[PDB]
Amino acid sequence: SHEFQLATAETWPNPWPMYRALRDHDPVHHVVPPQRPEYDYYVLSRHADVWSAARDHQTFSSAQGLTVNYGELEMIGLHDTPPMVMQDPPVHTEFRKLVSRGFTPRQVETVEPTVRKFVVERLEKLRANGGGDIVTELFKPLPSMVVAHYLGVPEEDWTQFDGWTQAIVAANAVGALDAVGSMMAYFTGLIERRRTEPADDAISHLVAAGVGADGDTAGTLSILAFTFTMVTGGNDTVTGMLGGSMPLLHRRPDQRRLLLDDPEGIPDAVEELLRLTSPVQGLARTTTRDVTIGDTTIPAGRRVLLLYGSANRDERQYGPDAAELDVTRCPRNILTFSHGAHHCLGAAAARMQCRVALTELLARCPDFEVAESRIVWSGGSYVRRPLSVPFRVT
Ligand code: HEM
Ligand SMILES: Cc1cccc(-n2cnc3cc(N)ccc32)c1
Ligand SMILES: Cc1cccc(-n2cnc3cc(N)ccc32)c1
């Protein structure tokens, strides 16, 4: 089908033609749900439009939620203490500044050897077995460790934390109350510990900066909400980037050759992979005012879906071969991590995981096969990530 529809597991394999029909025939597309016309919204599919809308937080607000579903915020119950991804400046600004102190090059550097060790352990197990599900065996568990590092969770608690994490990620995709409470109990304790035993992580930095201090319960709640932002945004996305890259590389032995002969091209290749997999394929904003883009006016008070996945595939920005893998492209201004105030804090961490995974895959498992038609995609309309990638190595 080329007709716009929110994605499902069944339609994640090939959304590209429908994006292309939008970009070409209706770049400011009005969706009026036949069974709910009251809940009409707009969809932006071109790079220029998505890039500007993402930046323009004044016109395009995150404060009412990030889906196309009106009433999202009250329905999930996030009004009183909304996460940072659903705050606009100026409210968003100070917290972002404080938590950013936990997202510097040092933090990505300190976890990289741990990432590499794990990737190696799992890839070697897979090789010995002649393959297995690279998602289950590696692409799922890996990002949970990195989120744990950024939250300053002691390594000894990573297994318990990964349990809560997998429950939450599953419940959140398309429901995890024990996990939510375990996590909220664990972090209440960790926060208290960081008051006297601070490290260089985001939670420590927030505590050291006084968030939650002196009976400031709102401050403490905001740290808890942040842990949820980290778990719900830092796992499934990475798994989509890693798993989604597998078919792309498999079908292009010429592109793998480029990197096998020149492993220094791997960082640029990671950017091209982030462009094409765009794990966050779309997120919404709410207009705060009428805005006209070309011949269409979007009324104030409507949701607008920013199709990052389409923007990243826009021939107007990347040329008529936008749909193809070119590891030497060095694509600029990709939308994979958004743009503006909310630009992904975990961008460097995600890039590092991709670089390490790709590097080791090519060194350890270069003769590998993936059956694309056997990949199973997660449900949910915003993030594209596989639940299973059947993987064989010779
Ligand atoms: C390839 C994987 C990832 C992708 C595609 C991704 C994408 C994004 C996007 C699109 C946003 C902004 C959402 C919006 O437009 O409203 C965002 C925000 C955020 N991401 Fe990621 N992300 C990834 C990995 C991670 C990781 C690993 C972490 C943690 C280590 C992380 C932490 C965050 C945080 C804390 C925010 C909120 C920033 C703010 O609202 O100011 N992300 N991410
Ligand atoms: C205190 C608290 C409790 C429960 C959930 C959250 N929470 C914060 N950001 C969230 C994002 C998603 N997608 C889901 C739940 C979230 C926060
Ligand atoms: C808390 C919340 C609520 C709703 C959507 C998202 N969301 C969508 N793409 C995301 C990517 C990251 N890294 C983090 C959150 C994301 C997050």
Curated annotation (Swiss-Prot):
One Pfam family linked to the record: p450
Protein family membership: Belongs to the cytochrome P450 family.
A GO CC term attached to the entry: peptidoglycan-based cell wall
Activity modulation: Inhibited by azole drugs.
Lineage: Bacteria, Bacillati, Actinomycetota, Actinomycetes, Mycobacteriales
GO molecular function (one): steroid hydroxylase activity
Broad EC category: oxidoreductase
Name this protein carries in UniProt: Cytochrome P450 130
Organism expressing this protein natively: Mycobacterium tuberculosis (strain ATCC 25618 / H37Rv)
Oligomer status and interactors: Homodimer.
Keywords recorded for this protein, A-Z: Heme, Iron, Metal-binding, Monooxygenase, Oxidoreductase
Residues where substrate binds: 88, 92
Gene Ontology biological process: cholesterol catabolic process
Binding site for heme: 96, 233, 285, 308, 338, 342, 344
EC number: 1.14.-.-
Cofactor dependence: heme
Keyword Heme: yes
PANTHER family per the UniProt record, alphabetical: BIOTIN BIOSYNTHESIS CYTOCHROME P450, P450, PUTATIVE (EUROFUNG)-RELATED
